[PDB]
Amino acid sequence: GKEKSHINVVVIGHVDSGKSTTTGHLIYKCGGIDKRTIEKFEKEAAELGKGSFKYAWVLDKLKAERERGITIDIALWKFETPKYQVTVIDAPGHRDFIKNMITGTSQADCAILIIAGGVGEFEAGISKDGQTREHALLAFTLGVRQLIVAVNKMDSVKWDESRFQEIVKETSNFIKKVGYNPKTVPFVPISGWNGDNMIEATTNAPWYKGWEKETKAGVVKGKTLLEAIDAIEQPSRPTDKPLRLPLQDVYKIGGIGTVPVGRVETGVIKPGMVVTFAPAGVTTEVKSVEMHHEQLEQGVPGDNVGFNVKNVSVKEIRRGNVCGDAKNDPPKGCASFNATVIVLNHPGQISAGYSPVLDCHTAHIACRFDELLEKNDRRSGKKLEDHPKFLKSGDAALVKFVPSKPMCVEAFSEYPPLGRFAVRDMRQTVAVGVIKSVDK
């Protein structure tokens, strides 16, 4: 076919919005995951009748197959579009996914909100205490500025235009409250099960003239959900930015030496460079770089590579440490750092002195809520008060943190992968923060 650029997408929605079917359908018809199991059920479908079969049927069997645990391919799902190589995530309901959506690999460039057109279903999906809103809120706070809304199950409502319109208005209010601007959001009416407006235009709604959205250069329109994905705007890759490679592991290979491993969040790693390991301050040359099978002449953002260095004991550098260019804004530890915290729903109240564990990139350290600088209006950033005495669910505030152990972090504005963290406590994520200033 043709060359394509990479983009990440996370699909969120209520437990019955039909997002697993919608997502499954795309990967199926636009990708190649577990094709073997697929080819097994497409041939088996000959039983159902004379051979015909609904894609959803095969998808259904594939799900039961995975539950048995006999499928090959892993959880990393991809699919292409007339322009994009997409790594998608069907947002899990599991609570431990929250941290992973903040400290995990590859932050989404766009989130697709799947909504059920059903009467009672819709209301239940947009609850203020539902998981759907939480995923939306997190996506927003973490900077996912692009969004797509898909009103699914339009078949169950006989494709009535009026019902579609009301859905759009209520959904626009809902996302507006999160912080999204509806005028930039394509509202696509589809049917994950029948395939309407998924990859091809539907024929069950003459009234439907297609979706549309305002952008910095004008208004973009379309008919299908695939088109909406393909319309996602190209994100800015931090290739030219300074090197930042949080360490995941460290090895000691005979005849080789010390070989740390990790992901290049920003910048480029090449052999011949002189790096530094923060917050230790270890400086050495990059002998070489490997990833998977080969050698690489260089590792770009997104690569999980291993590199070798000499004159550096494996007992000097460890997991959570940051690697970077010694001669280009190099990595350093901090005495403290100020961040914007968003308290999520949870049984509690935070106050100065609170010292939970914070997961920042590969770092796992307990930090102290030294000072509650100010409470702020989440969406605008405007200050509501100075030195509040405590924070509760829903609150947004500027907090000054103090790491208990040597730690290295960045201002979200400069190094996104190292300026967002998760606050662990009460067997869950009680808060998400964004670094605004660091005292290096």
Partner 1 sequence: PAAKSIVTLDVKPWDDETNLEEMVANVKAIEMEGLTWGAHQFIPIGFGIKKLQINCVVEDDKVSLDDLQQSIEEDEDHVQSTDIAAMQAL
Ligand X SMILES: Nc1nc2c(ncn2[C@@H]2O[C@H](COP(=O)(O)OP(=O)(O)O)[C@@H](O)[C@H]2O)c(=O)[nH]1
Query: Residues interacting with ligand X, by CB under 6 A?
Result: 13-21, 152-153, 155-156, 191-194
Shortest distance, CB of residue 390 to partner 1, whole angstroms?
27
For partner 1, which stretch binds (CB under 8 A), given 113-121, 222-230, 243-251, 367-375? 243-251
* Residue choice 251, 377, 379, 380 for contact with partner 1 (CB under 8 A): 251
CB-based contact 166:204 (threshold 8 Å): no
Nearer to ligand X, 155 or 370 (CB): 155
Site for partner 1 in 7-66 (CB under 8 A): 15, 19-20, 63, 66
217 binds, among partner 1, ligand X, none (CB under 5 to 8 A by kind): none
What is the spatial distance between Cα 93 and Cα 149, in angstroms, rounded to a whole number? 19
Binding mask 391-410 for partner 1 (x = CB under 8 A): --------------------
72 binds, among partner 1, ligand X, none (CB under 5 to 8 A by kind): partner 1
Binding partner of residue 191 among ligand X, partner 1, none, CB under 5 to 8 Å per kind? ligand X
Please state the closest distance from residue 189 (CB atom) to ligand X, in A.
10
Whether residue 37 is annotated as binding a ligand: the answer is no
> Is residue 211 part of an annotated ligand binding site?
no
> Should residue 290 be labelled a site residue for partner 1 when binding is judged by CB under 8 A?
yes
Q: Is 162 annotated as a binding residue?
A: no
Stretch that binds partner 1, among 221-229, 237-245, 252-260, 331-339 (CB under 8 A): 252-260
User: Which entry of partner 1, ligand X, none binds 81, CB below 5 to 8 A by partner kind?
Assistant: none
Tokens of 266: 């920003």
CB of 182 to ligand X, least distance (A): 23
Per partner kind, with CB cut-offs from 5 to 8 A, the member of ligand X, partner 1, none near residue 156 is ligand X
Restricting to residues 297-326, name those near partner 1 by CB under 8 A: 304-306, 308, 319
Longest dimension (CA), the chain: 72
Q: Which is nearer to ligand X, 103 or 152 (CB)?
A: 152
Candidate ranges 97-105, 121-129, 194-202, 214-222; the one touching partner 1 (CB under 8 A) = 97-105
Nearest to 431 by CA among 439, 418, 420, 422: 422
Quote the least distance from Cβ 229 to ligand X, whole Å.
Answer: 17
Select the binding partner of residue 249 from ligand X, partner 1, none (C-beta < 5 to 8 A, by kind).
partner 1
78-433-429 Cα angle (round to 5): 70
Decide if residue 133 touches partner 1 (CB under 8 A): no
Instruction: Decide: 417 and 265 in contact? Cβ < 8 Å.
Output: yes
Q: Can you say which residues are annotated as belonging to the binding site for GTP?
A: 20-21, 152-153, 155, 191-193
Q: Can you say which residues are annotated as belonging to the binding site?
A: 20-21, 152-153, 155, 191-193
What residues line the site for partner 1 (CB under 8 A)?
15, 19-20, 63, 66-77, 89-97, 100, 104, 248-249, 251-253, 256, 259, 261, 290-293, 304-306, 308, 319, 427
